[PDB]
Structure formats: C-alpha cells, structure tokens
Design a protein around this ligand. Sequence first.
Ligand SMILES: [Zn+2]
Lengths: 149, 50, 223, 307, 75, 249, 303, 51, 51
Amino acid sequence: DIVLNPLGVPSRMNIGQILETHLGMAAKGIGDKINAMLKQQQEVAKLREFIQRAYDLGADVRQKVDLSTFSDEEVMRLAENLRKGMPIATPVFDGAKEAEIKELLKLGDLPTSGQIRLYDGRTGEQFERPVTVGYMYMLKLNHLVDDKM
Amino acid sequence: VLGLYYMTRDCVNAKGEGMVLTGPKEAERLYRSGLASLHARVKVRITEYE
Amino acid sequence: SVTEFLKPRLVDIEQVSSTHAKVTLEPLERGFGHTLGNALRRILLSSMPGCAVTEVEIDGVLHEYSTKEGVQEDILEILLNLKGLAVRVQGKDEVILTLNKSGIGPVTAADITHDGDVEIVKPQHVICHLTDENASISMRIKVQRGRGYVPASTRIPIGRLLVDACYSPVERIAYNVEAARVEQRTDLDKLVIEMETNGTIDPEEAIRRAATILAEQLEAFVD
Amino acid sequence: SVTEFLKPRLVDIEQVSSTHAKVTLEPLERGFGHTLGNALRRILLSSMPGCAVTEVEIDGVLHEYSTKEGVQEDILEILLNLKGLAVRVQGKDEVILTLNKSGIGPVTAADITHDGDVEIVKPQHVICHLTDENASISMRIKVQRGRGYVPASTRDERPIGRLLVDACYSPVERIAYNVEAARVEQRTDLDKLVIEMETNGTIDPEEAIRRAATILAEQLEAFVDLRDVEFDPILLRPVDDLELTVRSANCLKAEAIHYIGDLVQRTEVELLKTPNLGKKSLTEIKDVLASRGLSLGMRLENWPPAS
Amino acid sequence: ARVTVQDAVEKIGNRFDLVLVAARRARQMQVGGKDPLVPEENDKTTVIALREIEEGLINNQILDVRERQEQQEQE
Amino acid sequence: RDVHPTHYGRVCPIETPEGPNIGLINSLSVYAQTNEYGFLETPYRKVTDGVVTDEIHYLSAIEEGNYVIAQANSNLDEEGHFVEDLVTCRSKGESSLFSRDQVDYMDVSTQQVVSVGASLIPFLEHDDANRALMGANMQRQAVPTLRADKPLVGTGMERAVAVDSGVTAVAKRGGVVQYVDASRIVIKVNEDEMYPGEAGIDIYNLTKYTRSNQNTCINQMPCVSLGEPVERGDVLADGPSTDLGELAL
Amino acid sequence: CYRILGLKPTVIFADQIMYTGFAYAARSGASVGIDDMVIPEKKHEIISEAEAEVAEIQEQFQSGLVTAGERYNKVIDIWAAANDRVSKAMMDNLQTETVINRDGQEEKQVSFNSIYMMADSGARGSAAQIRQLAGMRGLMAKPDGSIIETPITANFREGLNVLQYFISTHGARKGLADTALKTANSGYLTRRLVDVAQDLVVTEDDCGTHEGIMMTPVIEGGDVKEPLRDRVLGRVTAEDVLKPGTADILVPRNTLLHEQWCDLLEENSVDAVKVRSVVSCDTDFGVCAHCYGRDLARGHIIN
Amino acid sequence: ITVGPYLRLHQCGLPKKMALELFKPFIYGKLELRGLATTIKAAKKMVEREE
Amino acid sequence: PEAPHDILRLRGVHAVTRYIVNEVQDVYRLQGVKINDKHIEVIVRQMLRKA
Ligand SMILES: [Zn+2]
C-alpha cells in the first residue's frame, strides 16, 4: 500500500517503527491463517486448537486465556473477529522481545528475518536485496492542502 | 548518493568475473540481460579525452 | 467503447547517425508505455537473430596467453577486435574465412579473403597491426548464425581460441516514459526509444522485427 | 529450428474455486516466459471490463447522511455494501434492478427481483438488516458496464433523493505468474507459464486471457508499420450593417474598409487625417460603433481570417 | 538562451549590462514594431533578444548606430 | 522549562508543546493525584521485612525524598521477596545500588512516569526522546475516517481512553437489548436492578452527524444486536475513532 | 567538471547524475531491518570489567584511601574508556565480511550491511548515531552540566528501562529550548551585520596600492589547521613571488591566483604570499575589484 | 511543496488554479488580442466561467 | 586576553584584522563551517571608519 524511505530511520534513531512493522507482519500472518481455515469450512476443534496455540505463545506472560469455557458460538464469533489479524498489546516498558516476535513469525509460516523478496511491477524484475515488508498504523493529520493553497 | 555508491563497488567473487568487454555498452548489455553482476571485476576498453 | 483504446498519433523518428535513432510515440493509455517498452527492450536484447564470429585459430599461437612476434597487440586484444566485426551471410549458417598478411602497417577487415556470400559492413574495422617487415599474420575465423548472446565461459582440439558470440545486431537499446495529454485527459504516456545497432540493419528494421516477433507469439489467443 | 520460434498454446485450465483459477501456456522459448507474463499481468490488472452499481434510490431517504427506522445500518454503510455487489449483465450496457423486503432479518442479494439477463454470482452477499417487524425496505439500483475506476465527483440535474456511488469496474482482484521448465521430449530449453488469477466471479479466465492478448496485439501494430506518420461574430459583419450616412459610407468605401473588423483597428488620428472625412462624420462613426459596445483603436491578431 | 545565458554574458562581458541591452532590444521588438534578425521559433521577445545577442548581431554600439541612422533618415 | 527530578511519577517528561511554550505546558501522569492542599502525589508499594506487599501509599515530593524506592523492573519471587542482593533504587534525588534490606517502597507500574498520550506508543523504549515527543504531539491531531480500524499493534491502554472519554454509549444497568436501531437503543433491565414501581427500560438516543469545534463529524453507531445480553458498563455504541470500545485513530 | 568544462556541461552532468542515482538506488532494493544493527559479543565482558573496576574504586574510597572528587573522576575515566572500547569493537565487527574466493578459499572484504553502507557513503548517519544504535548511549549530563556517574549501558536495539529514559529526557528537553534561543539571537546578529555594511559596493577596477596582508598556513601547536592553498585561492598578489632558492620572479605582481597558480605554488613549496585585501584599499566610498578578488559564486574576478 | 523527480534544474511544477489566479491580466490581454473577447467584461466573464 | 583597541593602537591595522579573523575562524572551524576570509575583512573594514 505504501512505500517509505529507509534513510529516515538511522539518523532519527526511532527504531520502534521497524519493530512495529515486524510485529504487525506477524499479527497479519496469524489472521491470514485463521481466515484460510474459516474459508474452507473446518471443524471448530481445529479452530480453537490453533487459536489456543496462538494465545499460549510467549515467554511467561501474565495473560491467561482459556477456550474450554467458551461455547462454540463464542469461539466462532471470536474467530470471525480475528480474521483480519490478531491484535496484540505491548506495554511501554514491558513489551515484547525480538525472540517472541520471531516465534510469532514462525507460527504464521513467515520468514524470521522479517524481509522477503519483492518484484518491480513495471518490469517484473526482482530487487537485488531483501526488503522489509509489514504493517504500520498510519494517521491522517489535520493539515489538508485544501486549506493551505 | 546511496545509488551511486552502490553501483560503483566491487565484490570478490561475483557473477561474470574475469570477462573482457569491448566498452561500456557491452557492460550495460550484459547487466540488463542478467549475465553479469554490477560488482563483477572485469577489464574494459576505455577511450578518454584530454 | 469499452474495448476501444487509444492509438499513437504523433510518431516521430530522429536519426542521430546512420546507426543511431530516437523514436517518439504519443499518446498512449496510462501504463502502456512501460509495457510496450519493456517487452520490446527484452526481445531486442535477448532474442534477435544474426551472425557472429565464434572462434579463431592462429598458427603462431598455442595458448590464450601467448607471444606473437611483429604484432603491436596482444592475443586478447585481437580477440576483442574480432568480437566487434559486423558480418552478413546469405544462404549458409556457418562459414570459414582466412586472413594472411605480411608487411608493415594496419591489418583491417578489407584484408580478409573475398567470398561470394559473406559480406563486411565496415571494411575499415582494424583487426591488428604489423610492426616488422618480416612478420606474417595467419588466422582462420569461423562465423556462425544464432540469436542473442553466448559467453565463452558457458561453451566448453588444440589452439582453438574462443570468442564471445554476439549474434544480435543491437548494440544499445533504452526507453523512457513521459507525461502527455489530450485536450481533456491529463495522465497519458509518451514513449521515447533510443537505440543503435552495429550497421547490419537500420534501427527501424530492428524495431519492426522485434514487434513482429512479439506479435507472432500471441496468435493462438488474439481475435 | 534457429530462426523459427515455437508458439505457445493454452494447455490446461484448472478451477480451484469459483473466483480462483489457474491457466497454463506452453511451450515457450528461452526468455519469453517473463516477457509474456509481465505484460499480461499489467494488462489484466489494468484494462478488464466489468459491471458495477452507479446509482441507488431508496423509498424515503433524501441524502446519505441520514438513517432509516428499522434498519440497523446507516445509508453510507448500505452504499458501501452495494459497492461490492457482483453482477453479470448479458445483453445490455445498463440495467435497473429492484429490491423489496420486509420483516426481521438480513436483506441479502438473494432478495433482488429476478431478471432474465442479470445473474447474481453470490446470493449470500449481505446488504442490510431489518430489526423491526413492521419495517420494510424498497430500493431501485442502477448497474452499467465500463472499465477502470470512475469516482462520482468527476461525473441535466439530479432530483433530491438519488444517491451516487463510486464505480470500480474491474473484475480482477489479483494476478500472479510463475515460469517453470516444460517437459517436451525432444528438447530441454522450453519453458511453461502458469497464471494464478483471482477475480470476483464475473469473468471467465480464458476470455480474460484472450482479451488481454488481443489488446496487446492491437497496441503492437503501430511498430510493425513504423513510419514517420474563433473571431467574434460581430467582427465578421459587413460595414453595411452599420447605419452610416452617405458621406461616411462613401469615405469608408474609398479607404478599402469593408468589414467591422477592419474599421475597428483604425485609430482616430488616421481617420481624422483622411480626406473627405470631417469631425461630424468621425463622430457619427464612433457613435454607431458605441451603440454596439465597440471602439476605435483596438488591436487584433491574424486578421483577416480568410474572408 | 532558453536555459543558460553564458554565451550572451560572454558576448556582453558583464551580467548587469546584458540585462539592460536585452531589455532595450526586447522593448523594441515588443512595442516598437521591429522585426527579429533570427528565425522566431515560438519564442518570447526576452528570449529572442538573447538569441540575437548570442549570434553577435546586437549590442549597445549597434543599437546606438541604428538609432542615429533611423533618426537621421526620419529627419 | 526544565525536567526537575521531582517530576518522576507526577508530570510527564515527554509530552510538552515544542515552540514558545515548551516547558510551560505539562501533562499529568497516569496515576498522579493531588493532596488536600494541592500538591501532586504518586502511589508506591510498601516493602516490609524484604517482602513487597500490596499496601499502596501516596507520597508527595517532600515525603518521597526521605526514603529508598525501588524500580518496577525488579524481579520478585512468588511470595513477594526480591531476587538479587542488590537492587537499583532512588534516594535523595539520585539513583544507585542498595542492598535488599535498605529498600522502603517500590513503584506500582512501569507506565507510572508517562502521560496518557505517551503510553499509547508501542515500543517507546526503542525511540529517541525527541521523536517520541513529536509522535506524542502528532497523535492528537488525527482526523476520524469513514470507518474505524483497531491498531492491531497496541499497548493495552485503548479501552480506558475509549471508555473514559465519554464519546461512547455505556450501559447504565444490565439487561437485554429489546430494541436496536441505527439511531436508538432500548434495553430491558433485569428485575434485580429495577427500582420499585417502574417499567424497567433504558433508552439511548445516539448522536448522528453532529458538528464538532473543528468542523468535523461526530457520529455514533450501534455495536450490539437484537436480543443479546449486556452487563453494566458495557459498550453499546461506538463514537468517532472507536472500534468495539477501543481507540482507533 | 565546472573548473575544466564550464557551466553548460555541468548542469547536464548534474541532471544525469540525479537520474542515474535514483534509478539504481531503486534497483538495489536497499532496506533496513532489525538484524542490521549487529551488537558485538564483547559488550557484556567490557561492561562487567568496568563495573568490577568501579566497585574496586568504591571500596577503596570506603576504606578512606581517596577523597570524593578523586573517586568521581576515576569513575568517569573508567566509564569513558569502557565506552571507547565498546565503540571500537562494534565498528570493527560491522565493517568487514567473509566471502568465498574463486579458489574455494576465504577472503575478507568490506561489508554490504545496509546501515554500514548508509553511514559509509555519506548518505545519512554519523558514527555517533550508529554507536547509539548498536553500542551504548554512554554518559548523560545532569541539567546543571555535571556528568551522571553511571552511564546508559543499553542501546536502542535492546531498549532502555524507566530510569535511563528519564535520565535522557533532560538533555532531550534542553536541546529544543536552546534551539529557540539561538534562533532568536542569530536573527539579531545578522540584522546588525547587515546594517553596518549595507552601503559597501565595488566601484572601481584598480586603486594602484602596493599594500597587502601576508598569508601563511594556519598552524596551531603541531596541527596544520589550514593549508596555504585554501587561503590564497582567488586573491591578487601584492608583490612579486620569488622562487624559494634563487631570487627569480615566479609569479608576477597583480595576478589572480586560480587553480593552476596554486598548483605551481605548492609544487615549489612557497609558505607565505602577500595579497591584496579590502582593508588596505585606497578607494574612498567603496572598494576596487583587485583588492577584493574573485567572485566566489561565479569563478572569476568581481564585476 | 512536494517533490518532482522528473523535472530539469530550471523547471518547477505549478498548479494551474494558482497560475490562473496569478496571471489574470495577461490572460485578459491575450483574450482581447485574438478576437475572442471584444471588451474587458467579456474576458472577465470568460475567465469566470473557466471555458 | 588582549583588547582589540590596544592591538590597533600599538601594532596597527593589519594586526587587529589578523586577530579578529583568526578568532572568528577559530569559532567557526570547530563545527566544520566554511566561510571565506573576505567576508570577515569587509566587516572589519566597516568597523575602521572614524578617525
Ligand atoms: Zn583597492
């Protein structure tokens, strides 16, 4: 959807955006797996098994989610709400480490480095180095050019 | 600056290393065909004016 | 009016030299400049038929690094000179030519033995130089028909010196896409193509042949 | 052969799903797989025709910033849902569909009134919800055919109550292609092109491929034959339209002045120095010119316009 | 003259005198009704004057000579 | 215009307007209170006998300077004891290592020192402070769009900001959704919460396409369905830039 | 290109350079990832050894062997040395890579790491920023100006804790206020400078003065801060320049010293040249073109 | 301001609404010169309608 | 630290201009800023205008 210049990262030292991009990629991969299972209608047991595996990931986290106390309607509704990506919370100074991000990338069958092979849409030729592709949360600020010209 | 720096670099063992080219146009033709790396160390016939 | 697209109207050809040309076409639909330019450039680069020098034999030479007396240039210099010879062949796909010269001065393409079919487009192309009066140069050159470019590293008797084969007539090809408009439409494409050959064919002939080759591939789908 | 290429053919068409398909082209020479594949991908993603909703009229709504009693969605969300409706039209370039529903429950695409030429490819698509037992909805939907993306703001007067929708006409969602090695017994350098195509279900893969190839072949025929390829009406009226006196008219006839355009460019000093033209005649000329909002001393370019 | 004025600067010597000479010639061509000495190619008079100066056909001495000649002819 | 050491836990050191007013306009911290006299105080956990308890004491800047206060990064056992014989602590305006027995208090949270705006930035500890300040300022001039979209990478503070801002509709009593519509909701209250002698229904009239001070749209949408059960404090409608009760900018 | 060929080819060259650089920067696919910020393995050992030394000095102070300021300065020096060692290890690990030769052997070459290529080409990034990325942030100053004893031993790839971040906020905040203040001061300084000199114009070709100033390279201690060539380029000689050995006129008087003359001067090793300056100009109400010299924006003598 | 990578060093990109407002008397003069408008008010109306 | 007035009075104009130029360039050369010495000298000349 959007292409950003990588030369704005190293001089500004706002490394949070790269980690956010990696973790957003991982979350979208989890959502893609759930959506793929939902489309080819499979049994609720497989859905709740995979979702429990997704919620059990991490190195001794404080959150405990139990899907045995969910009815099948609740499990199906939750899976329908998670099919565009599983949302993730990382507190400000108690967040996620690189190892946990790499584990969550592995759960979605994604490269652990966070970098994939891209191609040029105008020529069909492969770029010579891997590129960092992910998901980032963009905002629209109240500085519209309609009010400036 | 990043692009000009990247294209003017050499790598020890790159594809197409050790060829002899008749000029810059043959080098461009080899690169655009995938037959030679941009960093391959070659020998080129160069004509320059003073 | 749904299956109807724009067609070029303002075609233009500018001839920088006898082998160097610049073709401009506008207007085009949005994004068609890249499609047409990339397809034509790929076909011109990699799949153009022609004839080229493949390998050579020199009597006083046994190895790619050898010393030949009475010649101003090394062996690989002579190979570079032979790689740039432009040749036309009619009625055959493999010919042998002989070069034998004794004396002092530049040995050029005109000194190659005359043949009925094989033709030279630049007789002034210098092959080598002779320094001593009592010096002889003797070589046998093989010219073969093919398409594209075949490096000598891929291809693998005694004394068979190997030359990179460049059958394609195209020396250089590049394209550019600019903005163009009709009275109302504003985001249309203008295509510019700069190309030069080795003199065997005119650039326009090369463009026409590339377009014909591309058009003959899509004949089981076109309607 | 050396100077003759092998020509590809459509080998296999595999239907993974209703909207997902694979197409195989084989055999291909060396290097032609990508050359054909990227051009075909660009054309398929760029220029395929299709049908989309362009206008809606609901029974009691006036604009899209309102609500309807008994319907849980806003009008904007209903237009959003209608924008995604997949419809195939078979005989016309413009059709009008009708929807009438009542009672509690989901209003989906299966409730649209039947028509011979129109096929709905996904009757489970949801349009809205009715949450009231006495609530009912009735709407008229307009569908037409085109290509590309035409936002509503770009396109004699609309009556109050007609709602516009942005039109996305293309049926193709995504294209991927893969070049592999073929298995022709004689030779070893032949390739094979495989195209994965995801659409909305309103186009056949083979006709899409053939249309893209046709567009490319039509565009290529400008290279195989590569060759080198006002005034305002009042200014054109004759000076006889002016109600000049005999003296002034004769003076103008003497000065080779025929049209209003020629007279208007003459300045006052030139027409003062000319013989047989006094102050009274010049004033009368200026008067008859001023009666039509014209003046002496104007300047015009590229006059006369081939009288 | 369309991108750089280097040839005109070289012909006139000073970048500040070039502006004055070019302005005088351009005003002659725009209001005085004079004709260009070079083929007009859909150029503005400001660029036509600089293209004339590049060819060496116009400078201050030439303009003064032509002005004296025209005044004497009209007298 | 400077960050004093006593701002710890009371005033956010990151959120201030750059320009003429830098250092003169400040934001409150997440847990900061005021005295009965108007002095900012912050909560700490009392540590006794080396066991970190759950007693919360609100200390002000005068009282705080006399103690040794540990950090929230300190690792604890399952019974409340510390792990290492040396812990990082603050005392008399500086920080250093202290033994396990010299500690008096401990911070309640790791987000105790930031404001609400800065607590919504994921991976804040990997960003430079200037860029964090710029991002925190930029985050509150975003415009709501046609549809909301939850961050998909958050910090866990979205529900609190969504619900405590008052832009949503919140159930006053538990019950069942008797009527749902694009513009109103009627909830049938449980008899356990009905006052005597009344019909138990709650009616919520949603706000549709209303202007704001910045000439933008304010619009509420229902997020419940007919016949489903609700509890006290649940979200019934979503305001602008909210998605199922979470902040979505 | 400008000095040899002039202005017209230079514009074309610059446009072509921009186009080619954009095209090949696009083609390379250069990106930034989290694995690009490589941390050296020796960081842990260096930090541990520094902590051991500072603890030993702490106990030595406890025993009463040293005073307070001595201990403070010793701790500061220890941490500074540790930071230097960490930086050296990081930069050494980042700048080289191992490649397989054509003979199957191993070779060492310059790294193709993305961050290293960004920093080394001059596109974006200094060495200090790379250190803060993958080394340690180091010592932070208290708002008054005093160095805080214990530095920030983390980088931005590992992440800071609450205390280190709160420590960094002090300098982060002081920077922006200083920015506003210095903007306000620089405006006033520029206005005064413009007002004092607004009426000075070049009004003559030559005043004929024989005065001038002697130009010598700027040398401080044992460091040559400024060579002669950068100081006499584009100025007019006020006296004949003699060959250092024999008194022969090398450069005649009244010569504009362009690149060729400066090359001649450095070839013969002349260390002092007398030039014409605007302070010693005989023109009243202005200056002459010879006492000013070359127009720096054009490359020739001033109009 | 945005970026234009295709421009030459002597070129800038100007929106045509700004250019229409900035160059208005020049447009009036050129409209009257070539006979499209006979009076100043006709040119004023033509520019207002954006024909 | 010597006052420029004394430098002008006892040593001359060239001494004071050398001192001012060297001090200003000492300030500017730490940060890598590159300014020619002409520009400082014209300001120094404008400071010596009264007798
Ligand atoms: Zn002077």
